Design a protein around this ligand. Structure first.
Ligand SMILES: Nc1ncnc2c1ncn2[C@@H]1O[C@H](COP(=O)(O)OP(=O)(O)O)[C@@H](O)[C@H]1O
Ligand SMILES: Nc1ncnc2c1ncn2[C@@H]1O[C@H](COP(=O)(O)OP(=O)(O)O)[C@@H](O)[C@H]1O
Ligand SMILES: Nc1ncnc2c1ncn2[C@@H]1O[C@H](COP(=O)(O)OP(=O)(O)O)[C@@H](O)[C@H]1O
Ligand SMILES: Nc1ncnc2c1ncn2[C@@H]1O[C@H](COP(=O)(O)OP(=O)(O)O)[C@@H](O)[C@H]1O
Ligand SMILES: O=P(O)(O)OC[C@H]1O[C@H](O)[C@H](O)[C@@H](O)[C@@H]1O
Ligand SMILES: O=P(O)(O)OC[C@H]1O[C@H](O)[C@H](O)[C@@H](O)[C@@H]1O
Ligand SMILES: O=P(O)(O)OC[C@H]1O[C@H](O)[C@H](O)[C@@H](O)[C@@H]1O
Ligand SMILES: O=P(O)(O)OC[C@H]1O[C@H](O)[C@H](O)[C@@H](O)[C@@H]1O
Lengths: 467, 467, 467, 467
């Protein structure tokens, strides 16, 4: 029973309650991609409203119906801050930080996944399509299948799927793999993730799998699980490109971008970073590179400025606190060394910026610095590109983002190679107008054609074909 | 020119000079495997004598001729402590510790590799066979080929070759890969390493490669490099099994093992660890597991004792210093909590133990704890097995060692799963005599048949076939 | 109202409840000194039973009546772990650790002090004598005077009173001083403490004070506070010397001391440390000194052994956790370097030892190592002396203990001067029998004559004279 | 022999060589006070030119003759960075940081002191007056007296002299005290320092001393040392007040102060800090206080700004590196939380500012924040006062500076009491014009009358009287 023929399930709702109450837009690219999707398409969205011990009364946000899931304080600590973001997040991002393996966290993760599955069953009509999202909910597909074998179940992982050598560290590796194999379709951004999953299915579970490489939105892999076949595919996520492109063309935004440059004392060049404050994002790398370019006199400290817009994220997790301390030290250091009173070389904001203000920064920025150590996709890169209909700008992009597989005309860097990052920043800052416009035209052709609608259609058509 | 038809090249000589002078046996399993080899087989051995600014006068150690390579203090700091053991070692072992990427270290690594290549050329006769060993010398095969295209060149990596996702971090990834591809044969312990290398050769270099899985000592892969073909294979290293087996049978060693038990106050059960003090070895894991078993009263603190024999290693490297501090804290902690005055539960020695004393500990030990987080092979596991001709004992072995692929009848553990480690230690401590003997007989059948002679013959026959 | 003519108030009761319930003897020298006192003398004892949220039902422990004070979990965290032991304790011991100044902790400290005052008033008969103990309760005398101006109130500080330059850091310096000035008599171990308090009363409060030096149990100072005069004195605390001396003579204890030496493999020399695991105690100093003597070959690692008996203390306070980690590291380090399997050079126990076992260790020990960085008195030094009626042994004693002012015939050291500590340990280990006996006879003459009865009589006679 | 009748000896020359060569003004208040002195008065100045392995060729800087002292790299590391600034500096400033006691450092300190003494003897004529400066050179007076008993020798300590309880930690306490007692006159900023020294002379040396309090520039103490009497006094150092006052009146400086306010976007209120980046200076305290006032909305983040001018100091000393990291973190943090792009709330410069630019900042600043945890005097406070002939401004001053004993009309704070610091900053920011001018007039009366000339005359008249 349940009234919805199409249900999305994620740890996040598109809204986030702030503590007296107040709704804000939820952070992260998962919401950035899925929100415009569910605003245009009928369907229900199940998720946590971002505070402990909330109501579970349905919330109507416009045309969209949200079903909130209650998490206790202990749930938030052990399932969300703990297993999800201090076990899985670091492990799947190439153990950039040492994962913590904790059995109590695992037990809570199982409990919460069960709660999400049950909530899904209550929302889902007979024979509904259910699309489960991301690493917090990897047990839900198997749990949901056991409760509701009538459902068609898709799972998409929004973060990298790590190499088998690292995944095998997880004490609950088999349970996680079994969880994912409960879906009819398991999707990843990149073929590499899909292939890691297929190999894992062979070694760990001993299931028969396809042995061919996986294509992009094509040439799907398969895993045989007794009576069932699980389809495996790569579907690189994107943004609502055309909408953002139109938004960035507004006179007010173009005016605001000019004002931002005026407020910065009309620099010749503005470099911009935009990220959650997360250790995967390489904010420390871009600051170090900028610092060394200033030290070497390869960037002019009088007419070049870097703006970093960092959103606070997962702040109770100790690794994130330590990262914040390190980034803020770099900011103070660089300004102390190269700034003047009344004129910093680095402007750093530790807050979410309103959407239209963010777009104005994209339009103002001569160089976009997107330097993650590892990122499943990175939508900030694609957002910048969509905003530059003027064909100005330059995107400096880490090759360890999923986006680099699509945005080859960007200035690609190995963020571990600081000399390469430094050389490339100089190249982007000094590019000719024609070379800049050539690259930006090429990037925009890709991003405008490969949008979130193409992504969702591809995944859901593949999911439907399992019926 | 040069007089030797067969030359081995490694950072280590089999001897190590201590600072007044004194020769000691060199540490590590590379010397453990290669020393008995070169004692029986004609050939020269090029390597560093373990001190800065040594002579380069040839050294005759028995029948064996050694050609020492001089390293300056800066060479030792930047090539050996730096690039080799603070860049490559952590990276190739699944970034257990964060690698440091430093261009000065790279430049020194290149310089030293060049020196080893030149030294090799001087020793090597026209058309000689040269066998280059391990991660410190990955540039030597290409360098040597350019100096001496008449030579047949083999390379063997004694440590894991990491997944492509991690290897690609290395700023000098291409130069390292090109270096290895200078060999006629590149060998790894395991098919997994060989397969990682083949994939890497495809993505990074763009060379045509075989696509099939690689066998054990068979079904070799190939990489096409313009005019040349490079063979790629898996050859799991081992020990001089029969010799060690005979050594362990000596009356004096059996008597010493009984005395060791007496000196420990005749415990019912002795657990033993033997390793270099290296963060890959999981000494912290086995101590934590023992501590928790004592806390839970699952091991009897009155009649069960753990002996850890740790060899100081790479002590100037800060990560190794921090590891030592942590291990020594665990030792003091556990004894403070569960020991009595005059009766520790953990005995910890931070020194190399003489060979016959080590063998006596192997014979005394009811349970061998070999719990690395990652190990290319681990010869300690195989040494224990070779020593237990009495068929007593139990081997607890991490699945993240190369040895686990051969020693399946051991008690295998995921060292990240502390509950699994704890449960398994209890199982080994309480095994029936018949189950213990069954496993030990099976392990010994494997280790006695698959010895260092089989390994070397397999590699060298494959190398010879490239002529 | 209240039934007792004599009431002692301290944060500790002589008993400590362990978490299922169980009574143990309370830690610390305050209980060591006051327990035998109150067992012989009529009177009530008010204090906290060592667990959160206890009953406040009166407890009869032998002839002694105890009135427990309830502390909530927050009280324990903010008043006891917080203000008392992370603000006052480090500050008064020469900021060995950085004090934390926290207003919430202060507010809780005030609240709890009020509760102790009220509890005291309920126990105290009209015109009773009340003796308030130590740094946790410095506000109680003023609070109690305001509730009960009929009472005669004494306060004794069991820890050092710091130099004015450090005391003045305290944001609540004036409130603390006013608190103490509520007493009729304020006592310290040493004239130096009394003199620091007098100076403080002059600068901080602006009260007229005596300007002369303060004597030992004589030549008291005075502070004029409007209508009242507060007497200030030095009264060095001690132990029940004669009782301990008789206890140590028992055949069983002498036999146990011989057995302990046998269990240690009959060493020629035993060094002993006995302390709470507290950063004031210099356990790290004595271990470093021992380590360096072994390294230098000035102590024989085959026949000399160090035993450290450390009682866990204030374990939730982070500074204490960090100290434990450091001490346990030193223990593991020293044994790894100089021990043999089956023969440590350091035996370390992290538990309270039963009294008769402790006495046996005192009797067994050739050298007693009492090396605090700062200690109000240190009763362990005096206990050792009382136990050695055989006149054997040697006391190595830091000059930064209050006991050093009385035990001048001990081997005094500056614990900050590691060479001095090392030289002195060698001197004590190699003393002639006659020199050892001469010193021990002199120390015992002092300790047997200056016992806890002399201390209490001196303080209480001075207090009575204020009536 | 030697040509000068008056010689000053200090670790610093008034000039500092930068590494290619370049002379800069030396840092610190010792040079700020002594430079104008020696520019007006005949005499020689012996000191180190701020680089290792310099010439010792005499340097003529204007009318002033400088005799440089050569220090080797090891001298700089062990005498200057080591004993002086990682042993004495933290110890004498109330062990704000844990002192390191190292015998090699002591031995180097002795050697270097000997070199300074010998250099002094070569410069000093028969019967000359020699004035030795500060904690780096405490052994020189005794050394110089032994070489040259004809000389009249003064010593002045520019940093606090710590309470006896802390000074006694020093393993070389007696040698240091003997060193100072080689002078005819030993001077300190404050009576408290002089009194600590007298007590120390009694306990440690056992010399007869005066027992009375010491006056300001009067009522001197005395220490009897066999045949000699050593005078002890308090002489609070100051600046060349009238000269600085006149300098600050220049039109260009007043214009620059207006421009600085314009460059900051014309804030209503500017707070200013000026210090060496030293852990004694409480830069962390003022930043924390500002941060919390912003969080609490007690300061307007739109029209109030803080400028911190920090001079890099002793940067190779690890404690100073850790301080820099912490301060720079606070700067980045506060701006990230409360700033806007193009508008920081904290401007931080990590460089020495030219004198006339510094004076312009003093004139611009509505509130001067001088919040040391401990400072011998602090001349920045007096400089600010001398600059405000307009009678504007407000000085917020830690009571743990020597200057607080003279500048009582400043807004005094206990920097450990963050609520007090916060309340006081608000009071200073919101003072009435008349109250501000009243305080500033009072402060200026003091500083203009009590200048460096009064200080030097007082010390030198006292020194002359010993002849
Ligand atoms: N400081 C910020 N202010 C406003 N929006 C931000 C900020 N940082 C990130 N975002 C937004 O969050 C989303 C990030 O998505 P993505 O780049 O895929 O990374 P992630 O999902 O890991 O957070 C983007 O839509 C991006 O514009
Ligand atoms: N504490 C020790 N004392 C004596 N020999 C040791 C000690 N620790 C390790 N060894 C020896 O060093 C060699 C280790 O080889 P292996 O297990 O392959 O690891 P690795 O090469 O990484 O050091 C073995 O021959 C082993 O017996
Ligand atoms: N490990 C221990 N086992 C048993 N008693 C101990 C232990 N450590 C200290 N004690 C006892 O605690 C008391 C310590 O008193 P004291 O030396 O004045 O120091 P403190 O009061 O600071 O703890 C002594 O009576 C001493 O014998
Ligand atoms: N950032 C700075 N730029 C220029 N001058 C500075 C700076 N910081 C401190 N000074 C100057 O250094 C001297 C500091 O003297 P003082 O306050 O007594 O402290 P200290 O001697 O401990 O450095 C002042 O003359 C002051 O103006
Ligand atoms: O939801 P947060 O923990 O605040 O992080 C925001 C988002 O970060 C990434 O995009 C994750 O893949 C999402 O699952 C997550 O929602
Ligand atoms: O040579 P060390 O740095 O002392 O380490 C000892 C050995 O450790 C491992 O076995 C390495 O694979 C060897 O290359 C190395 O020789
Ligand atoms: O009571 P604890 O915190 O366990 O410490 C034990 C004792 O240590 C010292 O002796 C203190 O002066 C006492 O007040 C305290 O009771
Ligand atoms: O000389 P620096 O180490 O650079 O420090 C600068 C100055 O700081 C303080 O003023 C000291 O009292 C001086 O002796 C010192 O010269």
């Amino acid at each position: 029973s349940g009234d919805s023929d199409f249900v999305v399930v994620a740890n996040r709702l598109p809204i986030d309650l702030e503590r007296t109450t107040s709704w804000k837009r939820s952070p992260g690219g998962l919401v950035t991609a899925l929100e415009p999707l569910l605003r245009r398409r009928r369907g229900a969205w199940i998720g946590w409203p971002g505070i402990p011990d909330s109501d579970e009364d349905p919330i109507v946000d416009g045309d969209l119906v949200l079903y909130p899931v209650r998490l206790s304080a202990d749930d938030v600590a052990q399932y969300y801050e703990g297993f999800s973001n201090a076990t899985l997040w670091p492990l799947y991002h190439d153990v950039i930080v040492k994962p913590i393996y904790n059995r109590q966290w695992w037990e809570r993760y199982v409990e919460v996944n069960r709660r999400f599955a049950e909530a899904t069953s209550r929302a889902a009509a007979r024979g509904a399509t259910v699309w489960v999202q991301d690493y917090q909910l990897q047990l839900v597909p198997k749990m949901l299948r056991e409760l509701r074998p009538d459902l068609t179940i898709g799972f998409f992982l929004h973060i990298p799927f790590p190499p088998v050598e690292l995944f095998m560290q997880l004490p609950w590796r088999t349970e996680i793999t079994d969880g994912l194999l409960g879906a009819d379709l398991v999707g990843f951004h990149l073929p590499g993730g899909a292939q890691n999953f297929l190999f894992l299915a062979r070694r760990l579970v001993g299931a028969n799998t396809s042995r061919a490489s996986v294509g992009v939105r094509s040439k799907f892999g398969e895993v045989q699980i007794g009576s069932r076949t699980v389809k495996v595919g790569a579907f690189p996520i994107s943004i609502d490109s055309a909408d953002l492109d139109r938004q960035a063309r507004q006179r007010s935004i173009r005016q605001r971008a000019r004002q931002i440059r005026a407020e910065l004392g009309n620099p010749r060049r503005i470099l911009l970073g935009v990220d959650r404050l997360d250790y995967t994002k390489g904010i420390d790398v871009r600051l170090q590179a900028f610092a060394e370019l200033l030290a070497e006199g390869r960037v002019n400290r009088e007419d070049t400025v870097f703006v970093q817009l960092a959103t606070p994220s997962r702040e109770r997790v100790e690794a994130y606190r330590l990262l914040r301390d390190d980034i803020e030290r770099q900011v103070g250091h660089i300004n102390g060394e190269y700034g003047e009173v009344g004129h910093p070389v680095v402007h750093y904001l530790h807050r979410p910026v309103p959407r239209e203000e963010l777009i104005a920064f994209f339009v103002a920025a001569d160089v976009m610095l997107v330097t993650p150590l590892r990122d499943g996709m990175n939508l900030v890169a694609k957002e910048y590109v969509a905003c530059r209909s003027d064909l100005g700008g330059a995107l400096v992009l880490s090759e360890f983002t999923g986006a680099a597989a699509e945005l080859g005309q960007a200035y690609l860097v190995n963020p571990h190679n600081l000399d390469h990052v430094k050389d490339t920043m100089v190249a982007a800052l000094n590019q000719t107008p024609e070379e800049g416009r050539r690259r930006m035209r090429a990037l925009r052709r890709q991003v405008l054609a490969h949008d979130v609608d193409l992504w969702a259609r591809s995944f859901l058509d593949a999911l439907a074909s399992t019926r």
